Amino acid sequence: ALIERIDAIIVDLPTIRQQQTLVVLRVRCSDGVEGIGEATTIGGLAYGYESPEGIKANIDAHLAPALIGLAADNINAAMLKLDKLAKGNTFAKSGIESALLDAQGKRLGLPVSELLGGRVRDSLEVAWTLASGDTARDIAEARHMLEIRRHRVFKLKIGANPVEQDLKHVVTIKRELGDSASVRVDVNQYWDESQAIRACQVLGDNGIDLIEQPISRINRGGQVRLNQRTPAPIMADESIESVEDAFSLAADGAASIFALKIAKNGGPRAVLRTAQIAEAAGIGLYGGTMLEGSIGTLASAHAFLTLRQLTWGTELFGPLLLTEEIVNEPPQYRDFQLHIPRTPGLGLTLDEQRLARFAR
Template sequence: MKITSITSIITRPPIRHPGKLGVGDLVSVDAVIVAIETDAGISGVGECSPWAVFAENAFAIKATIDNYLAPALIGETPFNIEAILLKMDAAHYGSSFAKTGVEMAVFDIVGKALDCPVNQLLGGLVRDRISLSYSVTNQETQADLEESRWLLDQGFKVLKIKTGVLPEREELIRVEALRKLVGDDFDLRIDFNQGGRREQMTRLCRQLEAFKPTFIEQPFKGFDLDAMAALCAVLDTPIMADESVLSWDQGFQVAKRQAADIISIKIAKMGGLLRSKKVAGMCEAAGVPCYAGAMWESGIGLAASLHFACSSPAIKYGSDFYTANYLMTDDLVVSPLAVSDGAIFVPTGPGLGVEADWEAIERYRVAV
């Protein structure tokens, strides 16, 4: 079986509301859909959904796939996924999001060809579901509380409040109000998205510890591992690295320098499923627990992330896999991912286990 064509499509499916983060505002989902055809008649689909304020952008990703990655892979067998990764690296440096979308579609093909779900190609399941953490991004206390009440009604057992945008006093008011709403025993996390300042963070985080957060995520710029390590050393609350791990090799540096107590693994940052598994294995060996992060993917990308997270013992803190079911008002798959009691289930069908909704993809297609 050989790859005969690789195409990419930029889509912009609708969302309920924008997100306001420490790193910048997110006003839309730009999902790049990758379709791969083979001479055996088996096709695969993948997705990468970048945040322009965070990493790559959709138009650059499409250009990378169309002009560099696709030409390098025509005629290759999908079964040699490690070799495909090396060929993509040789064709274009970096571009982990673009490579993730392509590799995801390749995994979909291989799973369909072997009549098994992708998680079986990654070592098999250690769980069949993973808890959902929803990110509260309104930056206004009453709006936060209103949305959080709705989320509790939906069965969520984990919430993450996005900080790093407002003045210090207002941040404390928001977190305190949310803690009062959910109760002392509820799993509440805090995420600065790099929005913290060195001169304030030790004091502010010690004040935030009074509200018993499960962890505090990415208080400093991703490159500032010295500040991350120093804060880890003085706080009782675990610090999680996200933007400090924008590639699979950076995960090693964060663990080596003890710059985080927890590492967030997003398959798009790592360059795909295989490299995410390598980072998870490295963290497991180093005794660093992980979180299954996500961008704002549709059910296509989240299905792939579920196969990774549910086959990785290192994932101990749940997932960000809520967007397709709770943020988007129209998904890009025919049948939504299964959710129940605050958890989302890994698909069981061959390949990714989801069917792309090509009518929806065309409906939200962005002209290039």
């Protein structure tokens, strides 16, 4: 089977929060099998180098033409060719690798997790981000998610308000939930090391389970110091923009936990290279997301199912924020987890009608 055509479609979907843009890839092979992938990011260029528009432009002008005519079943050769021709562009590469694995799974009749070696579990613990901004509303939401047994691990995005304000807000939530839930924070590189010194202490002292990316990736030394001094473990996220960054952080002792994102590494197979490095170093894992819809979520999920251990769970809740999707199969979230079927490929099929309706 040869790769015949690759299409990159920008889709804007309404969210419960007010819109999420995804780049849906469709790779059609000569044997009639089609694979689907997703390259999605948050806020244009605010959370990475690649925007939806840039991703589509590069796929159309550079990445896709390099693949037309190649064997669809030799994913390693195709991805290595992209590395040779394109520097970075991990989101685009991720969408493409996801589609090739999907097409390959359908072709062989195996779920992507089995193509990657075999799953050691069928479900993944899923965290939820509390985003009402209001403390009372956040505790109310958390208590609801617990009641319906959908989530018991909650993440709080902070760093935008005065430190003292964010600290009170987080400590209040953990204090009210007590031992019923795990509370973590994500600072998204918003603090400088001078602010993180005291903030990490207060959070660690008040039962916050982990602190994700407290300071900017440009401060390597600061990450190493906080890794050694913060009472709560430090998780690296934005500090990882490639597999090679993961080796560097591991060699430096810059974090005790790595967030694994297929978009930041370059696909399901690339994220596994980063996970393996973390494993060889004794670094804990967490399955991250870029707020992908079901396609990217499932592609992440399929790689995470093969991991020996994910000490801190995952935040694969992306599909839950969308009011509408472009696939026919809704994800199964129940009993604090995301359940992944043993269907061929990613186990998803496009809803041609909603796709046409939301595509640009």
